[PDB]
Amino acid sequence: MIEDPYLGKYVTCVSARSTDKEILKKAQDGGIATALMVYALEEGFIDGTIVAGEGDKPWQPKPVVAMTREDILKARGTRYNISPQISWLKEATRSFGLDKVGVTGVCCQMQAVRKAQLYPINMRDVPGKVAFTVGLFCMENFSYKSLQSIVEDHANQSLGSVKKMEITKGKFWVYTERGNVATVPLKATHKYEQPGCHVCLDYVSNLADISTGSVGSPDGWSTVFIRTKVGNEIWSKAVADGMFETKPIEEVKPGLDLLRKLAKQKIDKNQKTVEERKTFGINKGLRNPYA
Amino acid sequence: MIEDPYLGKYVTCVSARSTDKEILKKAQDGGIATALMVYALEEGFIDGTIVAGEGDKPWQPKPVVAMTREDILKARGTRYNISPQISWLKEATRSFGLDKVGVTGVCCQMQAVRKAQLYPINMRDVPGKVAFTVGLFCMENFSYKSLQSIVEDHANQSLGSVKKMEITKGKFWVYTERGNVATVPLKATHKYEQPGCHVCLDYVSNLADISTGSVGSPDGWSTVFIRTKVGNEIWSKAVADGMFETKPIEEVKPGLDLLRKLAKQKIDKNQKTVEERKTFGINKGLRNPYA
Amino acid sequence: TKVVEISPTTRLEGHSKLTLKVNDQGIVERGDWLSITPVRGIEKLAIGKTMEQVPKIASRVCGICPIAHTLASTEAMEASIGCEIPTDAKLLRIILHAANRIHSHALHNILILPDFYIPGTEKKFNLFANEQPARSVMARIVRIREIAQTIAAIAGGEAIHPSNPRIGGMYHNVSPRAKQKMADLAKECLVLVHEQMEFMLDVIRNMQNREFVEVGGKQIPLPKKLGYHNQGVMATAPMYGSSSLDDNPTWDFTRWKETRPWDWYMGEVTIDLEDPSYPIGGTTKVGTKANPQMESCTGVPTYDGQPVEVGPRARLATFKNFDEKGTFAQHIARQMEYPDCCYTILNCLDNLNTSGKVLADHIPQGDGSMGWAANEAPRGSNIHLARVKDGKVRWYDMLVPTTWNFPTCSRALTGAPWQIAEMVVRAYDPCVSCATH
Amino acid sequence: NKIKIGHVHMSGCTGCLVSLADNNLGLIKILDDYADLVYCLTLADVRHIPEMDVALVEGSVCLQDHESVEDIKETRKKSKIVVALGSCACYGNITRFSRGGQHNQPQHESYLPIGDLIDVDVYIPGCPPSPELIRNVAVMAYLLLEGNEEQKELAGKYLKPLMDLAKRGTSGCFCDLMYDVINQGLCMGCGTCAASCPVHAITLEFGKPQGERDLCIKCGSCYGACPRSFFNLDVISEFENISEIIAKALKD
Amino acid sequence: NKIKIGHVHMSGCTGCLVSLADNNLGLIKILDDYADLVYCLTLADVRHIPEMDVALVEGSVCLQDHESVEDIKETRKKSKIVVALGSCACYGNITRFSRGGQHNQPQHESYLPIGDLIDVDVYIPGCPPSPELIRNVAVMAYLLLEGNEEQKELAGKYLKPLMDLAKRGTSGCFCDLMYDVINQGLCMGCGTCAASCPVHAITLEFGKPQGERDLCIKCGSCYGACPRSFFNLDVISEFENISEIIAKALKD
């Protein structure tokens, strides 16, 4: 175990990408989140998983319980607006009849799952049926109207043409299907962030079985934390089964040094906000969920 | 002014009954509450009044804005269950277009009107348009299911046959149209009282312009308090116009001595209940609206 | 070019500012008038709510014109579900609508008169002051608004946030007495509004003959073409409105599109011109950064791809080819709308059957079809659009008059001395809480 | 000496100000004799919040709007008596339902009544608030600050329930009638709540309140108006005298 | 030494007891090793409330039923730890809607959660409450009273948010998510509230909660489950270890 104060508790950290070439075609990064859920399904570690499927408007995610490789793959790619993944967490154990639920999502959604496992409040059967969680790194998120405003105005792109979006190197990047690229400085995007993200003290999905993201690894590759016993069993067996290319993270640029720094900026900035809440008013303050 | 601690503030108190023989045919007592509202309407002191009209089930009152002598007379007779008179108080000044609203009801309903005059809370136009209030004496009230249980079980009468009900001389009296009489000891009725009556510290409608009831006067006659300047102007002019027979209350048996005693028992018993609320729990109590 | 900023604006409804680029004489070259009122977000919070609740929430967008949102929202729901309301419900709604237009135009007299001159003098109206003629004028205005609110309360259930409108018509018809009372009040009001109208037109006509006005001690020249813009106008009725239930609707949703402030507002600027003597409290400090594209709180609806002017002048131009434009023309057209309000009320009372039905016998629950309703609010075309399915609002959109007027007024600021930019603004009778919703 | 009164407009609809103005010549009487309006963006050109004896504050506070938060803090600093005017200021009202996501400020998501950010001395609940109540509070505030001791005593007694409401909390709903009246054994079926509800969300069934919770816009009126919320007998039993006193103070 | 546990049935539906029993062999394990059931009218013949280490109290209190009021007062007197078991006991739940008028006790009108009559140490909210939560609270209560100091420290940390809920108040509704989460700038759109709602009253529209208030039965579950109500990082980050500890305590 490593007990990093900004990267959470983990056993190891590698740089990885799926060896499944079909998965990689539309994966955001290394295809880790898709590849792990597909593999867990084929191996019987899960019988279904909650993923950010395609929704009713372009680039709007819709949470869905996926129970086939095909349905899991439909959720490839980052949607930078809210996907209420946990809304299907109980239902997966009811009408879907699952015994071994997988869950994908960002840090706060990983938090929601663990709170439900330990303090189930009208969440019967959920603590014992969560089987496998994969958490994405997340700096901040946006409402759908925010995402529309950023892509359509600031990047000047039609949503119906966008093939990929990416926040990296200080910019919001928009890639179109016909091959064009547009960028927006992140300074322009700040007004649009979901306000509840400003109180979030978790960057690399500390509470997931396995955590995965982009920062620290080259393009096409993911930085992966293997954290829990569940996480280590599944990762070991998938590596052994040929499912991933890996590199120790210390042999990779920018690697864990850049990552630990961005994690620190996130927590530091948000801890400050958390603190300003206490004296937000005159002789009174706002609620602190962490108190 | 007299400032009696149990009978409230009043100018005089007489025993009276209407000289209108048609009104008396179905009045509960002296016909004071009907006679005053009819007279106020004919004279222009009011252009309409809220009365306890006939409802959708036998002996269930329905509040209504009455604007004719005929509609006022439909409300004669005591209904011993809840009539939410104040529910039409604002509306009388809206779609009904009244400038001078009359209100009839029991003590707590008189209270509601005066609170609305002084602390109008989403009660625009109400303070200035209340013109005349007539308050009934009231010891306690009942839900409709309570009244059904009392009349049908304890008195063994069909509601469709009842011509009059009367609480007096320690009994609940039921008179049928075909001429029979049944009684129930009031001790049997206590379980059925509306619980919110047990906190009521007002017996003879202290806050009305004119208050009227039965206790203290013979049958067919009412005990009347004339309290406010509005009340004195209307009463004086109605007496002068020949609308009432009167007797000074001190020349009448049982008169004001019996009345002051029952008022005292009511307040005393209910003040006790009000007080027990404060220590109703262990280390905590119930709300006191009077605190 | 320099940049001066007035924040906040005053003697209008709600919270906005003017971010102005001016030439070396202080004449606006390009000005942005923008909402900085927080977005309460009525369109998004409406989704999933019941079609009965949403109009009562939308009412609380604005307490000067709640009739506009109550009626436009209700009638958008009725248009989506295909509900035809009874005649006497419609007559009561028109009476409510006309009465509120009286109170609103008269309230606006209060806000604009301090900029105006007692005719033939160099004295401005101070309506607070217990002197003549101000006090006599205030007494007339006060009685006018009192009559208006009273009628509104009788026909609409409440003067502010009317309670009588419901999906399918009204909760209540009125009594024979109430109908007489409304008529009595409208007769009194008609004489008063004719007097107030002639008074206001004279004051305005005196303004058009002036060459300067005094702001903060200084003489400010009055341009002849003050407030002129080339956006044209949009209006759906001279009085009430239109909805997609009509045989021939008078608004065309294929000609509408709403953008963000992005397409029409200035980006980042820095204030380099400050006047601490601007009454009362000065202008924005030198060095302040502003960004109208990002700070504007409204969307920008367009018609044929361009901002438009809505409101009284838009109505008279659309329906009578009223042919004067700019600030004083807008003031004139607003005053001219006084008598129609009282004549309409009296005609509607005449046709109202107080024993008539006020609620449709059947209220359908909707299948998700789109409907829309336009109410000609006192400030202009208020267009609500909705999809109702199973009694719930699945989609909601509000194009409110001051929303339309924000980019148009902005363009109308060109040519004005920045010290009277606020006078250009006030001729639009702005409702910034309305504009933002 | 006239007291100094401001109208502060937070995230409100200005219907609270309209309600004040709907006292008609009563308002002009008050402005003539008892009070100077030192601040009101809708009616006067004072651009920044000055010192006030009474701040009539309408609307709630958007947490994501910096100027708004500064305004409500500045208001408490500048004012002797802070009045939450109307249900948005008291209780959040329709802004309880705000949840962001609309152009052009999709982050404008969170709204709180002013009592969650500053200390509030007096509630005037209602949506819309009744003109008469706003008038009574203005007149009594004056008497509390410029009267003889008999007046300042009356004023303090009159305002007490409105100050108690400010100390009770910042939430208003149909449920208040359940939680604090029916569930407390205090409801007596008078029907006042039904008359006060601005959206007709309350009916009485067999003499007891029935709330259409998905119609209720959370304004707190019904509990306020209920005669079993507060019933201060010392004031309300003197209704005739207190009415005459208020009338005389407005007379010409 | 086994702790002493009672089940006290106020105005409840017994579904809270069923939820306890739905721990299956876990309940029998607890009764075998850690706890004696000294009182439960549904399962045992002890007629009167004895002394208890833990009283699991379900249902609310009818103010007009004398025996009920005496029972809840007697329970606090007889118990070291009082647990409001389920949403009726915590928050009133469907008995908030009670308003009298039904045979054969039309005066049975007023119901309050137990926390309005006695002091409550621990809330277990939910309707129905989750078996796992009731089990965790029983096990941790034992550890708090019979463990080493490392266990009593864990137990105290585990129970703290449930004790904080008991101190927060006695009201539960969909509005909690507005008042205390969205309106506070804390909602992040996870959707957990929607999963926990027992009546499907919550949907998410553009990532934000939308409450069908006339479906909501006022159980308080959604705020409880929300990860922005309480999120005690010291406990929840140790989910793997705390899970292993609880499992081992139930093992054969």
Ligand SMILES: Cc1cc2nc3c(=O)[nH]c(=O)nc-3n(C[C@H](O)[C@H](O)[C@H](O)COP(=O)(O)OP(=O)(O)OC[C@H]3O[C@@H](n4cnc5c(N)ncnc54)[C@H](O)[C@@H]3O)c2cc1C
């Ligand atoms: C708001 C958001 C912010 C992020 N910020 C960062 C960051 O700062 N640094 C960094 O390194 N990585 C960040 N990521 C993660 C990164 O963008 C990729 O999502 C991650 O590397 C997974 O890529 P992959 O190839 O393994 O997954 P893929 O194989 O492409 O599969 C996509 C996975 O992402 C899930 N997913 C996609 N969109 C959402 C969504 N809105 N909400 C919940 N789950 C979703 C899907 O369920 C699926 O599990 C963010 C992701 C999101 C949604």
Ligand SMILES: Cc1cc2nc3c(=O)[nH]c(=O)nc-3n(C[C@H](O)[C@H](O)[C@H](O)COP(=O)(O)OP(=O)(O)OC[C@H]3O[C@@H](n4cnc5c(N)ncnc54)[C@H](O)[C@@H]3O)c2cc1C
């Ligand atoms: C619950 C109740 C309890 C009472 N307890 C007493 C008592 O203890 N001692 C005593 O002397 N008198 C009591 N009265 C009053 C008495 O019964 C007569 O109502 C009173 O004398 C009026 O009689 P009248 O001939 O003047 O009125 P009538 O001419 O017969 O007119 C009847 C009037 O009573 C009103 N009314 C009838 N039923 C109700 C109702 N449920 N709620 C509100 N208003 C109603 C009508 O609007 C109308 O104004 C009580 C009345 C009620 C409703």
Ligand code: SF4
């Ligand atoms: S920054 Fe935190 S609260 Fe916001 S979406 Fe990402 S993990 Fe959730």
Ligand code: SF4
């Ligand atoms: S006893 Fe009091 S509370 Fe009960 S109905 Fe009579 S006047 Fe009202």
Ligand code: SF4
């Ligand atoms: S309380 Fe009602 S009238 Fe007052 S600002 Fe809020 S919505 Fe407007």
Ligand code: SF4
């Ligand atoms: S106003 Fe009357 S009916 Fe309504 S809750 Fe209060 S006492 Fe009960």
Ligand code: SF4
């Ligand atoms: S039920 Fe009506 S009066 Fe009571 S809080 Fe809701 S909207 Fe206001």
Ligand code: SF4
């Ligand atoms: S909380 Fe729900 S399951 Fe428990 S006693 Fe109450 S109704 Fe029953």
Ligand code: SF4
């Ligand atoms: S559970 Fe998630 S979506 Fe629901 S109120 Fe809490 S943070 Fe918002």
Ligand code: SF4
């Ligand atoms: S919305 Fe659902 S979970 Fe929340 S209090 Fe209501 S019924 Fe309970």
Ligand SMILES: [Fe+3]
């Ligand atoms: Fe809009």
